[PDB]
Structure 1
Amino acid sequence: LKGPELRILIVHARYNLQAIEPLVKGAVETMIEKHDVKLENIDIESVPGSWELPQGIRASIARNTYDAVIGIGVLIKGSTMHFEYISEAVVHGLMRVGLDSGVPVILGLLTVLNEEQALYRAGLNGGHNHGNDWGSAAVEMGLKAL
């Protein structure tokens, strides 16, 4: 599946940047190299934390036109219930924004127990980079939308 005409938006948070960067890279590279997406057609915005993800995406969806958007963030369990509540709220938020707008929203949210799990799913320490999968999913949903 190739989408030379696809316009993709990527909004990522900045918490746990060590895990986030590889994820964004994987997503971008895969779209470009495996799906012929054009670098100029990929916008990359960022927000402070995962909580801002739904809101950041919604604001951008109103500004420009995209065929698909990927929300990327990394939530790690802490000592409080903060993680549980934010996670639940962000996941529902992302789903709402996609259903409300009609624009496919790909879930690049990692909700892990600790750092190691995040890094692993970002392709480090022998793991598989999940951003790659998200890249392909974005392309696919973008096309099926047209």
Structure 2
Amino acid sequence: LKGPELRILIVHARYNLQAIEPLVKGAVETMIEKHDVKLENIDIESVPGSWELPQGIRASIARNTYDAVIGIGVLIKGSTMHFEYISEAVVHGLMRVGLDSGVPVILGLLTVLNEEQALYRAGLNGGHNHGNDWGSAAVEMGLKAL
């Protein structure tokens, strides 16, 4: 599947930036290299933390027009219940923003127990970069939307 006429939005948080970057990259590289998406047609905005992902996307979805958007962030279990509650709220939030807007929202949220699990899913230490999967998903959902 190729989508030269597709406009894609990518919002990512900045916590655990060491895992975020590889993910964003994989997502971008895959879209371009494999689906023929134009670099100029890929906006990349960012927010403080995962909590802000739904809100950031909603805002951007209103300003311009995209065919698909990818929310990227990584939450790591800490000492309190904070992890559980943010996670649940953010995931429900992204789903809402997508269903309300009609714009496909790809889940690029990692909810892990430790940094290692994150890096592994970001393609480091022998793992498969999930940002790639997200990229292809964005493209597919974008086309089917039209």
2:41 aligned partner: 41
Deviations 1:110-137 (A, max 9, x none): 0000000000000000000000000000
How far the C-alpha of 1:53 sits from its partner, in A, is 0.1
How far the C-alpha of 1:14 sits from its partner, in A, is 0.0
How far the C-alpha of 1:21 sits from its partner, in A, is 0.1
What is the DSSP-based 3-state SS (H/G/I as helix, E as strand, rest coil) of the residue aligned with 2:127? coil
Which consecutive residues of structure 2, in runs of 5 or more, have no partner in the other structure? none
Percent identity reads 100
Runs ≥4 residues deviating over 4 A: none
Rounded to whole Å, the distance in 2 between the matches of 1:5 and 1:55 is 26
Deviations 1:10-47 (A, max 9, x none): 00000000000000000000000000000000000000
Map 1:83-122 → 2, pairs under 5 A? 83-122=83-122
Rounded to whole Å, the distance in 1 between the matches of 2:127 and 2:80 is 28
What is the DSSP-based 3-state SS (H/G/I as helix, E as strand, rest coil) of the residue aligned with 1:93? helix
2:18 aligned partner: 18
Instruction: Output the TM-score relative to the length of structure 2.
Output: 1.00
How far the C-alpha of 1:88 sits from its partner, in A, is 0.1
Q: Please tell me the root mean square deviation across aligned C-alpha atoms, in Å.
A: 0.1
Rounded to whole Å, the distance in 1 between the matches of 2:108 and 2:80 is 23
2:79 aligned partner: 79
Q: How many residue pairs were aligned?
A: 146
What is the DSSP-based 3-state SS (H/G/I as helix, E as strand, rest coil) of the residue aligned with 2:70? strand
Which consecutive residues of structure 1, in runs of 5 or more, have no partner in the other structure? none
